[PDB]
Amino acid sequence: MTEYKLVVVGAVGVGKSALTIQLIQNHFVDEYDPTIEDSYRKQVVIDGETCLLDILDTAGQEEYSAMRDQYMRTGEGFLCVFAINNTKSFEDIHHYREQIKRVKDSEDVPMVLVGNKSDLPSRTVDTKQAQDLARSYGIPFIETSAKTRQGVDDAFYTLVREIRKHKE
Numbered sequence: 001m002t003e004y005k006l007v008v009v010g011a012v013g014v015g016k017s018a019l020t021i022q023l024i025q026n027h028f029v030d031e032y033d034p035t036i037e038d039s040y041r042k043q044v045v046i047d048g049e050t051c052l053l054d055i056l057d058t059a060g061q062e063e064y065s066a067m068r069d070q071y072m073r074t075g076e077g078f079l080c081v082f083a084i085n086n087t088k089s090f091e092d093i094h095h096y097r098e099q100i101k102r103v104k105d106s107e108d109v110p111m112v113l114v115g116n117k118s119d120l121p122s123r124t125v126d127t128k129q130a131q132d133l134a135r136s137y138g139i140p141f142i143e144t145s146a147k148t149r150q151g152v153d154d155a156f157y158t159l160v161r162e163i164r165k166h167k168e
């Protein structure tokens with residue numbers, strides 16, 4: 001059983017932790033909790049092969065900018081979870097791209113783009129904008145949801161799929 005280091009960062013109010021809880025114990029929390037650092041290790045069967053997802057739900061804030069590089073180096077899988085309502089989180093991906101590139105020492109790395117709370121009527125971030133930017137970075141886009149659960153399981157599957165192509 002191979003373990004995969006997954007670092008989850010982004011903006012605040014996106015519902016990063018909510019997504020993980022939906023996969024870990026299949027539970028949805030309406031109330032928001034200030035997650036500083038949470039370790040979620042669940043064995044998931046990706047494309048027939050069971051892998052151990054070592055997901056680290058951390059806070060991508062300025063107060064953790066000096067510690068971010070610590071886990072980003074060992075991190076293999078990166079879930080770029082942004083919000084469709086909060087267009088600012090969509091622009092925050094630029095800063096992350098620059099940092100991750102510096103921490104990984106590589107421009108081409110295995111990463112996935114996922115938009116949470118896609119079931120919200122307030123869609124500020126347009127699908128074309130997200131899709132276009134996804135191609136620029138070279139990462140796939142998946143519309144996720146913690147309340148409605150829209151292919152959340154497959155979102156994690158595809159993450160490993162991209163990572164596998166970086167090896168084999």
Ligand SMILES: O=C1CC[C@@H](c2cc3ccccc3[nH]2)N1
Pocket residue numbers: 005006007054055056070071072074075076
């Ligand atoms: O001994 C430690 C301190 C950091 C923590 C950790 C790093 C990390 C990176 C990617 C994914 C999960 C991760 N968990 N383990």
